[PDB]
């Protein structure tokens, strides 16, 4: 009963929230561990709840008041330019929805980043360097995909052109 009560609260809180809720926050609200929250959300996903774990916390997927522009972008940068690439995108008001790496063993690996602010980017880059941080390894020579989302196609164009000026796009060859 208590586990089902806890998961009912998680759904309520995620539906009411306009921002990601960290596993740590959800764990503190329910007196469990972040690991228990992982298991709760896993069970909810198997019940077809569209809950996504992002780099900033859990979100319940729903639609916006205006339909946003979206684009798949092929990128490439050196092993020290991740923070500058991501900051360039959020500074143009672009949501960095995900990143995909073409891994020789796993195939395409996609992480739901949902980076939106400078603080999102700074905290994510710090946490990845403090861990193993090998999602964008020497395996693809920095080549990777992003799904980007913005209010207009004009805004995506300016952000993508800002990537090219820094040499962060995959050069058609
Ligand atoms: O965009 C990048 O460079 C990136 C994003 C997530 C993880 N590693 C690299
Ligand atoms: Zn990138």
UniProtKB/TrEMBL annotation:
Domain Helix-turn-helix type, first and last residues per copy: 6-59
A Pfam entry, by short name: HTH_11
Protein biosynthesis as UniProt keyword: no
Alphabetical keyword list: Metal-binding, Nickel, Zinc
Domain 3H: 73-169
Cross-referenced SUPFAM superfamilies: Putative transcriptional regulator TM1602, C-terminal domain (SSF75500), Winged helix' DNA-binding domain (SSF46785)
GO molecular function, one term: metal ion binding
Superkingdom as given in the UniProt entry: Bacteria
Annotated positions binding Ni(2+): 77, 85, 144, 146
Binding site for Zn(2+): 85, 144, 146
Stated name of the protein: Transcriptional regulator
Species in which this protein is naturally found: Halalkalibacterium halodurans (strain ATCC BAA-125 / DSM 18197 / FERM 7344 / JCM 9153 / C-125) (Bacillus halodurans)
């Amino acid at each position: 009963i208590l586990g089902e009560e806890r998961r009912s609260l998680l759904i309520k809180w995620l539906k009411a929230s306009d921002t990601p809720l960290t596993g740590a926050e959800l764990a503190k609200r329910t007196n469990v561990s972040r690991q228990v929250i992982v298991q709760d959300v896993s069970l909810l996903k198997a019940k077809n709840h569209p809950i996504l774990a992002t780099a900033q916390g859990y979100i319940y997927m729903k639609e916006a008041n205006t339909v946003q522009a979206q684009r798949v972008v092929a990128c490439q940068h050196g092993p020290a330019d991740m923070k500058d690439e991501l900051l360039t995108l959020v500074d143009h008001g672009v949501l960095i929805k995900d990143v995909t790496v073409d891994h020789p063993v796993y195939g395409d690996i996609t992480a739901s980043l949902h980076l939106k602010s400078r603080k999102d980017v700074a905290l994510f880059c710090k946490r990845m360097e403090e861990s193993n941080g090998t999602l964008l390894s020497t395996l693809t020579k920095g080549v990777h995909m992003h799904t980007l989302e913005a209010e207009s196609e004009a805004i995506l164009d300016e952000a993508i052109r800002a990537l090219e000026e820094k040499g962060y796009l995959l050069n058609s060859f």
